[PDB]
Design a protein around this ligand. Structure first.
Ligand SMILES: N[C@@H](Cc1c[nH]c[nH+]1)C(=O)O
Ligand SMILES: [Hg+2]
Ligand SMILES: [Hg+2]
Ligand SMILES: [Zn+2]
Length: 257
């Protein structure tokens, strides 16, 4: 099965998932001097006031916090998007050291971790149909840097011990994702893909310029998770990020000058 190890890592994915060498693969390096300001880009609209978190799960490659998406409770609109996108789950990518971990990079700079809030286009009825369309998904990317602790993140940090191994899940209600947003919503945007198999190219990426800060202690706890299932040799869940891919025929736009 695909993974992040030497024998099943990102460099091996193409064998099982040919799209890995596609034309709109993510992540990519964001070259700030090549990104173009776009005056026509609307401000991002994030309505997470009625969000309903349901559970937290270790899927063997990261941990997802899942939300109820049977209604427009938590939606993303505006920006380069056309229509309403419902939040379905968020997860992170992190490294074994503070100097690496994010998937996207800015002028080649790597961050300690990267948060991805996944949304699907409501006009397609459900997530499953959404990943069969070029504009089916919208992912909001937020960089994490090691510095001061992020209060709103501690709730996630404390429940990790209960989902240490692959397959474990735990009730995780009443979590407010608004506590994970930076102050500014300026962003870069480009058409891309999910960063893990099946690597589907249905994503409009929105990567925020402002990173949020997390404490060393908070990031350390992410690193105590396991890729393995209970009762198996322990493999720490670290460096679950994909290397930057070629931009090819794509332009990265900025919402700010
Ligand atoms: N890997 C599955 C489930 C998943 C959702 N997010 C991460 N993984 C897809 O396809
Ligand atoms: Hg997995
Ligand atoms: Hg697609
Ligand atoms: Zn991700």
């Amino acid at each position: 099965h695909w993974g992040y190890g030497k024998h099943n890592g990102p460099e091996h994915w193409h064998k099982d998932f040919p799209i890995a060498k596609g034309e709109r693969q993510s992540p990519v390096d964001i070259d700030t001097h090549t990104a173009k300001y776009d005056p026509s880009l609307k401000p991002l609209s994030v309505s997470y006031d009625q969000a309903t978190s349901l559970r937290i799960l270790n899927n063997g490659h990261a941990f997802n916090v899942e939300f109820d998406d049977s209604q427009d409770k938590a939606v993303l609109k505006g920006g380069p998007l056309d229509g309403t996108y419902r939040l379905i789950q968020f997860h992170f990518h992190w490294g074994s050291l503070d100097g690496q971990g994010s998937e996207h990079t800015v002028d080649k700079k790597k961050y300690a971790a990267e948060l991805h809030l996944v949304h699907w286009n409501t006009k397609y009825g459900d997530f499953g149909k959404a990943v069969q369309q070029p504009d089916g998904l919208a992912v909001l990317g937020i960089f994490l840097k090691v510095g001061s602790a992020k209060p709103g993140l501690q709730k996630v940090v404390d429940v990790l011990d209960s989902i240490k191994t692959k397959g474990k899940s735990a009730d995780f209600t009443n979590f407010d994702p608004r506590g994970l947003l930076p102050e500014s919503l300026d962003y870069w945007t480009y058409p891309g893909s999910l960063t893990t198999p099946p690597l589907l190219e249905c994503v409009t990426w929105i990567v925020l310029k402002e990173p949020i800060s997390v404490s060393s202690e908070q990031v350390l706890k992410f690193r105590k998770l396991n890729f393995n299932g209970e009762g198996e040799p322990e493999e720490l869940m670290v460096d679950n990020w994909r290397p930057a891919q070629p931009l090819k025929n794509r332009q990265i736009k900025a919402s700010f000058k």
